Design a protein around this ligand. Structure first.
Ligand SMILES: *C(=O)c1ccc(NC(=N)N)cc1
Length: 245
């Protein structure tokens, strides 16, 4: 997250921290995700595509810090890693950038809700807020494009939804953005998602309910003028989510 503020898991209790075990046993942070039911985390296929083996991954719920345990956190194996078979990626745009992780603890349990572990509602089909709506994004990604390190503390920021029309413009992304993507950005381009935030949630309030409108997916750089963050338009993937859960 470029700009924004530090937070704890109490303020995004559906947020999933997904890590990969390297051959040799070392564990590095991969991507965010969102708990959509006790046994299901939703994330981005791009996060997993190079290392598609479910056994290499660890999912935490209730976790506020990158490399330190949060009190109350729960640790899961991935019992099913479902990538989108229509996934495609060019130099920038990621298409069908959506992934499902069925989670299972060593004791064979799904998430148990708590002050720090809750599910997020999916949108109603094709039901998205209007352009200019303020939404939140959460993650452990870079605080600056030039950073090497990821922050140790979870971050959140607010971005505003951009129309398909505005996002299609020349000096934006042209035809790189489709109706199955949502663009969001700051009016001053001062806050954004960045490397390590992908897979993570874009949450909007829809008819007074906190809703997973988006999945952090792609962008040209981070917090660049005329280069908004691009999100998987969750409301356009309900049949795929339904058929895989
Ligand atoms: C994901 O890791 C990801 C998503 C989006 C960006 N870029 C922007 N939001 N501009 C970088 C990395």
């Amino acid at each position: 997250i470029i700009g924004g503020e530090f937070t704890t898991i109490e303020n995004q209790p559906w947020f999933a921290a997904i890590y990969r075990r390297h051959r040799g046993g070392s564990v590095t942070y991969v991507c965010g995700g969102s708990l959509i039911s006790p046994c299901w985390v939703i994330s981005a296929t791009h996060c997993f595509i190079d290392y598609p083996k479910k056994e290499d991954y660890i999912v935490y719920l209730g976790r506020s810090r990158l490399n330190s345990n949060t009190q109350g956190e729960m640790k899961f194996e991935v019992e099913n890693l479902i990538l989108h078979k229509d996934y495609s990626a060019d130099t920038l745009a990621h298409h069908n950038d959506i992934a499902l992780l069925k989670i299972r603890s060593k004791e064979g349990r799904c998430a148990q809700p708590s002050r720090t572990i809750q599910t997020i509602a999916l949108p109603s089909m094709y039901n998205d807020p209007q352009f200019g709506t303020s939404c939140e994004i959460t993650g452990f990604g870079k605080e600056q494009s030039t950073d090497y390190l990821y922050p140790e503390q979870l971050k959140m920021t607010v971005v505003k939804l951009i129309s398909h029309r505005e996002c299609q413009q020349p000096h934006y992304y042209g035809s790189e953005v489709t109706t199955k993507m949502l663009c969001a950005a700051d009016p001053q381009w001062k806050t954004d998602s960045c490397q390590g935030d992908s897979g993570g949630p874009l949450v909007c309030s829809l008819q007074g309910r906190m809703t997973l409108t988006g999945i952090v997916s792609w962008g040209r750089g981070c917090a660049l003028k005329d280069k908004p963050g691009v999100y998987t338009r969750v409301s356009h993937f309900l049949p795929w989510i339904r058929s895989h859960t």
